[PDB]
Amino acid sequence: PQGLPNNTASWFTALTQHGKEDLKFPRGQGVPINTNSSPDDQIGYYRRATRRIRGGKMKDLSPRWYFYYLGTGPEAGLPYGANKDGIIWVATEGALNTPKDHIGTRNSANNAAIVLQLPQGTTLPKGFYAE
């Protein structure tokens, strides 16, 4: 079996925002589970992406937050903690403040995104689901 391609460069599926609350995590939480990574790699950001369709004006759909490792993706040039709307920062204890060159971005045409999982007990804002 093969699913439809996800043309985003994030290595993980998005966290869909079903309510009015933006995505945010308490300090030390939010980094997606990746068994092929070390404690040093557990740092990055989520970026809000929005699909837009016409209805007759151009309305938007439920916002989706995609995780990118530190120093990679659409905000590769932003240092950790940099303020920008739609960008929220996450880091597990013990992570290094260095760009994750070795992990990088996903090639959407040949690699499937990993289902975003978070450790049990992770606090999520209202309208978000770990599923």
Residue numbers in the entry: 42 to 96, 99 to 174
Sentences from the study reporting this entry:
One central protein involved in the formation of regulatory ribonucleoprotein complexes (RNP) is the coronaviral structural protein nucleocapsid (N). N plays a major role in RNA genome replication, translation, and packaging and has further been found to interfere with host-integrated stress responses and stress granule formation. The N-NTD possesses a peculiar, hand-like three-dimensional fold, with a β-sheet palm and several flexible loops, arranged as fingers around the central β-sheet. The latter, together with the extraordinarily long basic β-hairpin finger, constitutes the positively charged primary RNA-binding surface.
